[PDB]
Amino acid sequence: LYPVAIPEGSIEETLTDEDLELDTLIPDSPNQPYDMHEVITRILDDDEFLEVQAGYAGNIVVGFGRVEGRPVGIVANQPTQFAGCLDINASEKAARFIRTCDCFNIPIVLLVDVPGFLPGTDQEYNGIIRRGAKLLYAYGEATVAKVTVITRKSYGGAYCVMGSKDMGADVVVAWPTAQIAVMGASGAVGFVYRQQLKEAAKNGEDVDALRLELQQTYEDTLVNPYIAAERGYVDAVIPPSHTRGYVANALRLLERKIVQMPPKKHGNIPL
Amino acid sequence: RPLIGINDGAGARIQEGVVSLGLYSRIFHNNIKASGVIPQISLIMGAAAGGHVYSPALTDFVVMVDQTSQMFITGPDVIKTVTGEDVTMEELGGAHTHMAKSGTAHYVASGEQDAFDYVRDLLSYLPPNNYADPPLYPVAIPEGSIEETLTDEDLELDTLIPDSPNQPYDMHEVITRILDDDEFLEVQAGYAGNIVVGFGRVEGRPVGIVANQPTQFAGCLDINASEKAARFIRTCDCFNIPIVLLVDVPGFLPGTDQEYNGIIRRGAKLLYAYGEATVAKVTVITRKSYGGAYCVMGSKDMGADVVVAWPTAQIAVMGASGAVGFVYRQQLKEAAKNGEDVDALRLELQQTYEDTLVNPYIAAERGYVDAVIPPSHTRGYVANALRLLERKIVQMPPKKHGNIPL
Amino acid sequence: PRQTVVVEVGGRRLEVSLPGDL
Amino acid sequence: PIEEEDTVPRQTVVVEVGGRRLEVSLPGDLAIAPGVVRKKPKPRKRGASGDAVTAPMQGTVVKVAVEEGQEVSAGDLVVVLEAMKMENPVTAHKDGTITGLAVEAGAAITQGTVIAEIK
Amino acid sequence: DHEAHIKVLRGEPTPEEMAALMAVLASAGERNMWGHPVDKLRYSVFSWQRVTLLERTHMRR
Amino acid sequence: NKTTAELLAELREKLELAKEPGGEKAVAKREKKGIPSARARINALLDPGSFIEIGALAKTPGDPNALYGDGVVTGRGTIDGRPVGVFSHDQTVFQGSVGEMFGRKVARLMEWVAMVGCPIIGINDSAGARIQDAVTSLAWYAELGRRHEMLRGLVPEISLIFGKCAGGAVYSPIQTDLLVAVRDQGYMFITGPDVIKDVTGEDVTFDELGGADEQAKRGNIHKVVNSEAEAYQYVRDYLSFLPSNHFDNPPIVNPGMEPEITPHDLELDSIVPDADNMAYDMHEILLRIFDDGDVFEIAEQRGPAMITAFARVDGHPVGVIANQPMVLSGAIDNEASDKAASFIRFCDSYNLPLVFVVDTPGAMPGVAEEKGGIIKRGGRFFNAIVEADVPKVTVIIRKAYGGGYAVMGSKQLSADLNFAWPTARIAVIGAEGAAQLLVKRFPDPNAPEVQKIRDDFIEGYNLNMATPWIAAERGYIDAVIQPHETRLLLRKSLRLLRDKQNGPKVQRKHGLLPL
Amino acid sequence: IRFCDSYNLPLVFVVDTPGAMPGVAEEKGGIIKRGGRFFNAIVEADVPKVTVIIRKAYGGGYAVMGSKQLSADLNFAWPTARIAVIGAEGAAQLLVKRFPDPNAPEVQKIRDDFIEGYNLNMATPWIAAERGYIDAVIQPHETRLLLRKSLRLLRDKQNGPKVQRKHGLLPL
């Protein structure tokens, strides 16, 4: 625990100009990616980030840094690689890194921007169900301080493989641009309004205009952090600039943490 | 108490929204929490889709129905849209797919009744929790030495191994003779036939067999076999079931595919599983145990409690073909310089090495093999070892958990 | 089976073969 | 209890069979104690090289044959014990010197009393 | 034979009465340490009962 | 190269040769001496056919003319159907000397027996250093010495000295819990008579320096027997009282015999002599107060004023410490003290209740005792009896004075139940000592004045002081009982105390013992 | 040893002994059992154990004075060290006893030949270093700083595996 003096004041009083760049980091169009290192290096002390396996599974970024002298392991989705999808390689990379952190009591901070799992028969035949269950198992067994920052997408099962409150995330915070949903609105519409698309097709209406209008309504209503915050899965919706403050303060609060688990010899991780 | 999940559901109920994802997260967290505490068995009985797939993966055993059971994360139409590939659900995630290719499924029942029968068979071997001893049937213990109590079914082993080291045999011939009542519950029979793993009994006591299979890939260890054996061993050691290795391994499966897919990292898992395992570990060596695969297939220093070898065992650093090429490299080089019949010299040296070192006795001499036994004795030695090692007073340095290669 | 139960009656040994299980 | 079968507890019952008053002893484990072993119990008897001459039973010491410091040989008389007005001559079990002597004539004596020490 | 037998201390039955007697008398005649109380007891960090009760329960067979 | 059948036959040939790896010459020499083979010995000790040999073909690396087994037989066996580990030195190979593989095999067996948790029996024929590789034997003596500590207080260790246990070979046996030796065959010494002569010129025979009876009197060895068969029987009996390990329970044998007051109990009412100077054999009490005559005596010759024995109460094993008035008036000498202490600690480590049968004037006064360390040995006895967590019950028969009263399971030092027979005499010192000390030294003369004044003081002291009634009034003893009560009262007392949990005690690395 | 282990003091052994003293006085004194207790104490002790061998480690003297085989953690020898079962003179006596000593110059020659061979090839630390029984042969001036470095490393020594039980046993 390298000593550093924390500046006194509120979380919003102590905002640096570098923190304020997070408020403008996220592109307006959800199709435009951004480099998650821009968040990592700003929440970390001194931008010092020891990336582990930088050339492997670049769709997820894992590595060490410090938050107020405390070592942290950062695990983060990377939109510029495979749109940030989870896959076999990223799941195994993250799972082992998490388990090493948990062995040595290094808090884990998750930066989440995940649309889902990389579609493909190659992923299926190589075991994405069994392989991806390892990242669940690692995060669920991880008893160290686990904090989650949601930046943009957290869809479907990947909202669970990235660390949700019921997976024992100690603090979950979302940026305003977070998008927490069962699936993207384009897919959701085909289920939720299937009956209206049916009757529109029987009437021969402009079913593509109805598709667009319904998808718009869905995205405006549901594909936002507030529903999750209402259901209590996101503890706070914060301005991005606050993220460094929130991570630091939550890690300090979670410096000491007891979690009770049933007695076992060992865990039978899915492989 | 054991948990049984009969799974048949297509995804989150999207109308409910995120609530579904929260209760998925809770179900998964409970499956992790319970993992290694109580046996968890899943039966897929339909199209399990979306989040429904991770719960089976976190449970200890997965039964599927041959054509009525599908598992996949993403829909075939999604796959088509994003990649153009056309697949039916059956091709994508049918029982054959998850047995042979993905290796997620443990059994592919011919029907729902067969599936239930298989799950009852599993539960017959499994204790209700890690603080319980496996269900131990009383047995008519025979009395006298192994020599005095050999059955003819045991004597059948004395003639089993083919004379030529290059001719394979079905290891089930050994398994069903050493196990009680010939009855063996194979796990993942279809996935990686170069390793056979499953449950049985000896003197009524549950055991986990793990065995090389000479008939496929010469019995090489590959990635799939290494992971199959690792997870089966770890399940057994979670639930106190002692494990018996039947070893006939020439080495690892050579190839750039195996290397690029990580035979190093993913084969190291079987090392981890075996070294961690604190239940009784008995090794019988039948023909080969070479090189690194000697270490992986339960060497003594890995903490094999009882290691025995048949007289046909061949325990060596490498086969004589290569060993000659290293041990006699200089002499062969001189014969090549002088223009001798270097091939005849190789043949003579190879014969010499085969006759000298490629046998069990060198390892018995080092004490890596406790006894070189007539094959018929195997069931006696196994039963004696398992009867004595009910409780092993063994421990490892206190840790939160292992950092298993993952 | 038969349960051959030995009884002593005034010192006379008297095996009674009962039906086994019962 | 002298043989192995004698160690088993027994319950005695009266059984009437056709009116005949039979009396029957039932062993406490008969298959007609989770790890109890039965074996022939050892008699309450001392199955020696030791120096002590010891009284074989309670009685009175009607005669003392030895004197302090005398040498004796195996079979020589040491004392006579009157028990129930029967003579019980007690004799030296080994050769050696009487080197301690507690008894005297007319003394009442209990079993196992060390009469004398032969060294 | 050191087995403890039944014993007819008094009287003699006929064989038929013995058959009735014996038929009547014959007609009349896994560890799971999960949640064992010793785990439920609260011990001092230095309490000797951690040896002499807790281990002497969990280890004992 | 070879068929399976040819390989199997070659195997059988090797396994047969491994039965006599020294060959015809060494067989000849051994049959000349007339000494059974190490494996015939193991086969005699173990239950018929129960032996599985481990490392039969183990052979020293790189010596081209090494011999199988490296000089030791090692394996596992049942005795009376219960597991044991066995090793036995094979004098035919390298004179039985400790090689590398010999060390490895015995180490592996000690690991196995610690892992399963079962007794281990060594059969100790001479195991000297290798003539060709002495430093190896030095290292493996140290290795086995280390591996004993994983066994101490975990599993019963026995050694059967059937030869000259000479030099560094002694370091492993002396760790073991029970040493049996054979007369005129077993010897134990750290240096040979010849070496002693050369260094010092002191002259001693093997019988004087080494001999088994001398070592039993010195207390290095627990039993001397006349034959190996007797040794094996003594081992079977010894183990018949003991659990396989610290955690498992001992055999329960013939429980519930004689549920009532017998004539044999009523005979105790008159077994204590009327005159306080009269000695008697304590065995006349021990054979009657326990379930039967199976009082299995251990270390008989060592400190013969003290009896350390196993017995059973209602079929449960108990360790019995009794004084022996027949010897040294029952005074607790140096060897009685150390015998008691070690027997106590053994019994506690194997959960045997302790029954103390007291009849002692206390420590033996004298210069040879003081110079021999009676203070420190008694301190060890004091410590052992309070360290022991087992049920402790005491029966005071006649005199129990001073430190004898203390160490023989007083209620102080935390004995659990204290009974006295009405003959008991509890005091700091006997009437003779109290008179000779305080009263008699005031007169100058041994006049018949002081004679009658002294006799009257004895008369008063043997009534008002050296009687149990003070101790009973103060509750130092819990009851004064008629002797015949003792057997059934012990059954009830140990039944009550069976589940004793001792405390409060603070857990620590270990206690400390005057050493 | 047992006191130091109870109060967690590291144990530094400084060894220079021919081992147990020969004689009937010591034998009748019990040297065997005291040695067995010394063996027990040193193996029982969990504290850091460091041994410096300064010049003579024979037999049980080697074993008991913090041999690695008896769980000494770090073993150092000065180059004067001599590790053996017995000294050269005793091995000679074990040899010249082949015949009755004539005091002949031939026998004195065979004796001194054996002495010098033993003192060069046998009773020297190099065989122990080769076999790794001792971890270093060190320049004597190094010893103070090497003790510091070794005990700094061993500060947090946890001994294991050990099986907890009511107590061990040592032969009283």
Side-chain angles (χ1 to χ4, degrees), chain B residues 22-63:
Chain B
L23 284 110
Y24 277 148
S25 299
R26 208 175 300 159
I27 299 159
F28 304 162
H29 189 48
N30 286 337
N31 277 350
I32 295 158
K33 183 189 296 172
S35 187
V37 187
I38 52 166
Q40 309 188 99
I41 306 179
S42 299
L43 301 77
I44 292 83
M45 294 293 209
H52 279 71
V53 303
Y54 297 106
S55 173
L58 296 168
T59 64
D60 306 301
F61 297 100
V62 184
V63 180

Side-chain angles (χ1 to χ4, degrees), chain B residues 105-120 122:
Chain B
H106 300 75
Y107 187 61
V108 179
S110 65
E112 304 198 17
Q113 292 295 343
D114 187 56
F116 303 141
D117 296 349
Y118 195 92
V119 172
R120 296 197 220 85
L122 279 171

Side-chain angles (χ1 to χ4, degrees), chain C residues 1 4-7 9-11 14 16-17 19-20:
Chain C
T4 309
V5 188
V6 179
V7 187
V9 183
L14 178 63
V16 180
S17 151

Side-chain angles (χ1 to χ4, degrees), chain D residues 34-38 40-41 43-44 47-48 50 52-57 59-62 64-66 69-70 72-75 77-81 83-85:
Chain D
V36 173
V37 178
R38 307 298 173 182
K40 183 165 183 153
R44 300 186 184 282
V53 184
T54 61
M57 77 292 290
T60 289
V61 177
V62 62
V64 183
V66 293
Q70 180 175 10
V72 301
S73 72
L77 185 69
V78 185
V79 300
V80 186
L81 305 189
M84 305 190 75
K85 302 185 178 174

Side-chain angles (χ1 to χ4, degrees), chain A residues 123-140 142-160:
Chain A
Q123 294 294 310
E124 200 63 74
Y125 301 165
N126 291 279
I128 185 63
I129 288 170
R130 185 183 63 179
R131 305 262 212 140
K134 299 169 184 176
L135 183 51
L136 283 166
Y137 197 105
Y139 192 86
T143 68
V144 77
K146 312 183 300 202
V147 178
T148 302
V149 184
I150 305 176
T151 66
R152 268 247 232 86
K153 298 183 182 181
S154 196
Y155 291 169
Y159 162 95
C160 319

Side-chain angles (χ1 to χ4, degrees), chain F residues 68-83:
Chain F
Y68 293 112
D70 198 34
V72 71
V73 186
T74 46
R76 56 180 179 262
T78 63
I79 288 179
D80 293 348
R82 294 192 296 152

Side-chain angles (χ1 to χ4, degrees), chain A residues 92 96 99-100 102 105 117 124-125 130 136 143 160 164 166 182 262-271, chain B residues 17 22 25-26 32-33 35 54 60 92 102-103 131 231 235 237-238 265 276 278 400-403:
Chain A
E92 295 193 335
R96 208 185 189 218
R99 286 188 80 69
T100 314
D102 185 69
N105 318 293
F117 305 85
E124 200 63 74
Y125 301 165
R130 185 183 63 179
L136 283 166
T143 68
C160 319
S164 60
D166 312 79
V182 173
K264 64 179 71 184
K265 189 186 293 176
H266 52 52
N268 210 26
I269 197 162
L271 280 182
Chain B
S25 299
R26 208 175 300 159
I32 295 158
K33 183 189 296 172
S35 187
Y54 297 106
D60 306 301
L92 182 58
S102 93
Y131 282 7
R231 186 169 172 71
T235 301
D237 186 56
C238 291
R265 178 171 59 92
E276 183 188 54
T278 63
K400 298 177 57 181
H401 51 72
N403 198 22

Side-chain angles (χ1 to χ4, degrees), chain G residues 100 102 104-105 114-115 117-120:
Chain G
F114 183 83
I115 274 53
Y118 204 81
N119 287 344
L120 285 171

